[PDB]
Structure formats: C-alpha cells, structure tokens
Design a protein around this ligand. Structure first.
Ligand SMILES: C[C@@](O)(CCOP(=O)(O)OP(=O)(O)O)CC(=O)O
Ligand SMILES: C[C@@](O)(CCOP(=O)(O)OP(=O)(O)O)CC(=O)O
Lengths: 321, 325
C-alpha cells in the first residue's frame, strides 16, 4: 500500500506544555491552535512486504537514526492497530524556510498519521487520526483537523484528541512570524515537557488552563480580537514562566524576543490590533486581523535583529493527495 | 529645635525576594525574604524637630524634595509622631553617595536611616526589632536595612510580627555584589504598584506558598558559606518573582534585552568554572553575586558586555547606625 498526505503546522493560542502521560502524550492541560496554511509537510508512505526494518527519507536525505526510530516506533502503532506487520519506506518533504527554526513535529506526524494509515488500507475518522498523531507528537493531534482547533486533554488515550472549533474561513487572522537572525539550538520540546514538573509554578499554571481556554474558545467563536490578544500573550508568558523556573531553567527567549513582545503590546495599545505568542523558541508569532498584516509586517521588519517575517493565514485540515 | 539626630543606612540586595503584600498599607508582605546590605552605598539623614515648623521639610542632596517624596516622608513622620505621642514637625536633611542615573533604589536605605534618626531625635531608644518594624512601614525592604550583614525579614501577619533580623554579620562571608548598570533604562513602574499587581498573577499564590522552602535553603547556605546552593537559589528566586511580574495583569516586564544577555552569560560563567550568580529587582540592572576572590574577574567580564554602562562593586554592609554628624 501507498498514500500521500499533507498537513500544516499550527500556532498554539493556548499552549501545550507538560504531560500527564509522557509515552501516550496525554497532556496536563488542553490547548487551542490555528493551522498555518502556507507551510506544509508532504509525506508518502510505502508499505512493502518483508522489508526488514522501516526506512526514512527527509527532504531528500537519509534521516538520522533518532528521527528514524521515532517514525518507526510510530509505525509500530499503525501496525499494532491494523494487524498488518509490514515495514515501510517513509519519504517526507516540507517547504519550511531554510534555517528559520520552525517547528515541524506537528505537521509531520499529522501527515505521517494520515498517509501511513491510508496506505495500510485503514479509513480512520478525523477524531481517530488525531488520537494517532498525538502519539507521534503532542501538537500533531491539532494539525489533523483544520482551522481553529481545540485539543481535549483527557486522561486516557481514547479521551485525548483534537477537534475543529471553527473552520479557517470563520476568522481572517494572520500569523506574522518574526524569524530572528541570531538563533540558538534549543533543548527539544520532549525534554522541556519532562522538566515542567520541576517548576514550582507548573501546577498552578495547569489548574488555571480551563479559565484560559474558555476565554479563547469564546473569543474565536465571537471573533473578539482584544480578548484573544490579551489571553494569548498571558498564556504564552505563563508557559515561559514555567520554562524559566524549571531546573535547569529553559530560557528560550532571545534578547530581541523581549524587544518584539514589548513592541507588539505597545502597537496594540496605540491602535494596531496585534498580539504576540512564542513557542519553545525565540521566534515571535504576531497574530493580527489580516487587514492589519501589512502594517504589522512593516513594523516587525524595522525591528533590529529581525531577519525576516513569514506571513501565514488560517490553514485547513490534513488531507490525502 | 526640639531634638536632633543623624543616621546612616545601606541599601540591600534581596537573595529571596519580597514581592506582594498581605497588607499593603502596613507593608506586611506575603512571604519572607533575605538580603545583604551593601557596604559602599549610604544614605545619611539628619532629623531636626522644630517648635515652629507647621509641616515637615525634606532636603535631598541640598535641594528641596519633590512633593511625592515629601508626602512619603511626612506620612512616615506621622507614625513616629503618633508612636512618641509628640506633635513636632521636622526638617529632614539627607544625602547619599548613589551614582546618579544608575537606577539603584535608595528607599530601603532612606527609610532605615530615617527610622533611626527620627526616633533618636525625638528621644526614643528603640530595639532593633522595633526599628525594623517602623522602617518597614515607609518601605518594606527598609526593614532589612536596619539589621546588619545578611538579613532575613520575618513576614508575619500583623504589624508587630513583620520585621527583620540579622542572620549573619558582614564579616561572616566575603561575598561581593557586582552591579551591572544598564546604559539604557527608562522610568520603571514603581514597586508600590508592582506589589499591588502581584495578586493578578495566577502564579503568585504558588510562588508565595513555596517561599519557606527557598528561605530555608538560602538561610542554610549563608550559615554554611555554601555558594553553589546559594547561587542556584537566588537565580531561581529572581526568576520566580519576574515570572509573577510578567504574568500579572497588565504584565510587568522589567527586563531589558541586555538583562537577558547578562543572565545567560553569568550562568555560563558559573558552569564554565567562575562562581557567580545573578539576581534582579524591579528594574533591568543585574546584581551579580560572587565570592569576593572572583569579583575582579566577574567585574571584568561584566564590563565588556555591550549595553552595560558601568559596574558597581559592593561588599556586605553593617547595620543602620547613629552618628554624631
Ligand atoms: C511549545 C509548544 O509548541 C509545545 C509543542 O510541543 P510538542 O508537541 O512538539 O512536544 P512533543 O509531544 O514532545 O513532540 C506549545 C504548543 O504548540 O502548544
Ligand atoms: C523587587 C524588590 O526589590 C522589592 C522591593 O520592594 P520595595 O521595598 O521597594 O517596595 P515598597 O514597600 O513599595 O517601598 C525585591 C526585594 O528587595 O525583596
């Protein structure tokens, strides 16, 4: 069997950080995100019988074994669930700008989930692809559905999955991603999550998440941008508060990250609707009603230290091609 | 001329931070804190109660204070007047040697000095405990500048339970505070309103509940001269406070981009083998704590960091003192 599927990365408005079950990637808290249309992972899966072990190609090159044992531990699940014991060649490509440091894990395991199961013949519901993608990478659950997506955290493998709050066309929001020239090579998120429990502030952050989710959920449905803007900045600061207070601390911010966060908040307070959020890295995502993207991109491009500004709009669900 | 006294006091650098109040008017804090007095900075204050004064007058470095500072000092003198059962108003003359434009807060030094000088001028002989309770009500961390050396503020729940004591004299441990003064720094939001916003942070209650763990670690570290335990906790405690500041509504981002550069560098220096640790107050300057043998090396590295206007060297200071000037 053979299939090919594409998925978008997503930007979390309410952050996933910390695991209730690290293996199954059942999160301590729920999260909400928007798919990013202009960036894509395309992955083809080819099951061939009696090939010894699994094979992984990434952007044309033989993936490193860390990458391969991730995908083949993943494909083990697609086997345990299909009965079928075939190994497979995985070929994946993405169009992510060169060294901008943009996280691919979500888009990649969303695509891997859709192509692998379709290639091995199955026909999973959207809810079930997301339960599957989740086990490859937490935030991958959220790239399976489209548009604005909520991840229902749950306490079991069956209860933890994501669903579309709203389709992409429901709210014309843009993400202007400030890529920082100077960029470091940060601790990967899987370790970061594990260290969240060393933070004295993680329990309080986690317990407060339903308050934050309800405000953002309502804001997306009602298209209430100022409520969205203040909450995503607060949620992003809460996650980084936890990161910065872990042992050892995780300081993903670069000095220019600080400049951008302060500038975005000043821009919004003086009239330009905009808001910042950061993942486990120094790039700064600026969310704005798309009618303001030009202005936001202009102001971001003038900030010393900003290498370039990517422009992404609300993207759709993972799809077979 | 009903009574006259002069006192000196030092500012202090908090190893475990005061942030947030249980009672904002009395400055009873939500949690306890530990600090070190800075030998080389001093506020000298003379109080002269005058028969004929209708109101207090405050002179700072030879110039009339602005009205907000007068108001603060006059409200403090009200408490002294009430405490002593005396009504006289006072001339307050104060000087300090703080570098101008450095952004180093003098309020702790100022109200410790004023607490000693004013009560002495008015005829009282207060215990150190009572001096620190009184200083506390002018500015919280001023209660930590009344005792000497390494100091712990006991938080309490009442005005009579909130005060600071010396946990070790200065000479017990040769630590240096190398203060990186950042060239660029604007008027930061005053601490008084920052304290008040602490309650809007979802993380403040957790930070507060955890303070006794941090205080017990730093207290033991000082008594045992254990720099490594001290270093990791002051950095963690500084980040805890700024975590609450940055998650308040509205957020308080005291850090400057340069703040971050220094914080990362200091961690690298320590891990590379130079024993140092950073801590920040409600502003962008970075206090770099080290065993005094390494201060020269630390200051040299701090000095060459772009955006660092200057580095101030401070050793452990003694208690607020009466003098004859
Ligand atoms: C900071 C985040 O982006 C966390 C992403 O974490 P991951 O989903 O990439 O972690 P793993 O499950 O280990 O692959 C916040 C978010 O996207 O919600
Ligand atoms: C951040 C800090 O420096 C807090 C100083 O707070 P203040 O004592 O200056 O506040 P007021 O009581 O309003 O005068 C941390 C610390 O010194 O413990």
């Amino acid at each position: 069997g053979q299939a090919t599927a594409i998925a978008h990365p997503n930007i979390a408005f309410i952050k996933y950080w910390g695991n209730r079950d690290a293996v199954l990637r059942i999160p301590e808290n729920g999260s909400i995100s928007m798919n990013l249309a202009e960036l894509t992972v395309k992955t083809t899966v080819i099951f061939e019988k009696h090939s010894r072990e699994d094979t992984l190609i990434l952007n044309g090159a033989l993936a490193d074994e860390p990458a391969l044992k991730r995908v083949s531990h993943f494909l083990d699940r697609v086997r345990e669930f299909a009965g079928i014991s075939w190994h497979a060649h995985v070929i994946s490509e993405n169009n992510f700008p060169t060294g901008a440091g943009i996280a691919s894990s979500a888009a990649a395991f969303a695509a891997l989930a859709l192509a692998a199961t379709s290639a091995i013949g199955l026909h999973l519901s959207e809810r079930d692809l997301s339960r599957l993608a989740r086990k490859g990478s937490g935030s991958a659950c959220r790239s399976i559905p489209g548009g604005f997506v909520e991840w229902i955290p749950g306490e079991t493998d069956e209860d933890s999955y994501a669903v579309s709050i709203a389709p992409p066309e429901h709210w014309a929001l843009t993400d202007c991603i400030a890529i920082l020239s100077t960029q470091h090579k940060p601790i990967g998120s899987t370790q970061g999550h594990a260290l969240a429990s060393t933070s004295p502030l993680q329990p309080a952050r986690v317990a407060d998440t339903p308050r934050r989710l309800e405000i953002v959920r309502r804001a997306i449905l009602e298209r209430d941008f100022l409520s969205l803007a203040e909450m995503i900045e607060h949620d992003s600061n809460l996650m980084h508060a936890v990161m910065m207070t872990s042992t050892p601390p995780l300081f993903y911010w670069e000095p220019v990250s600080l400049v951008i966060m302060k500038s975005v908040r000043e821009w919004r307070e003086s009239g330009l609707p905009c808001a910042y959020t950061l993942d486990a890295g120094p790039n700064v995502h600026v969310i704005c009603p798309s009618e303001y993207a030009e202005e936001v991109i202009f102001r971001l491009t003038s900030i010393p230290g900003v290498q370039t500004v990517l422009k992404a709009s609300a993207g759709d669900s993972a799809k077979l091609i």
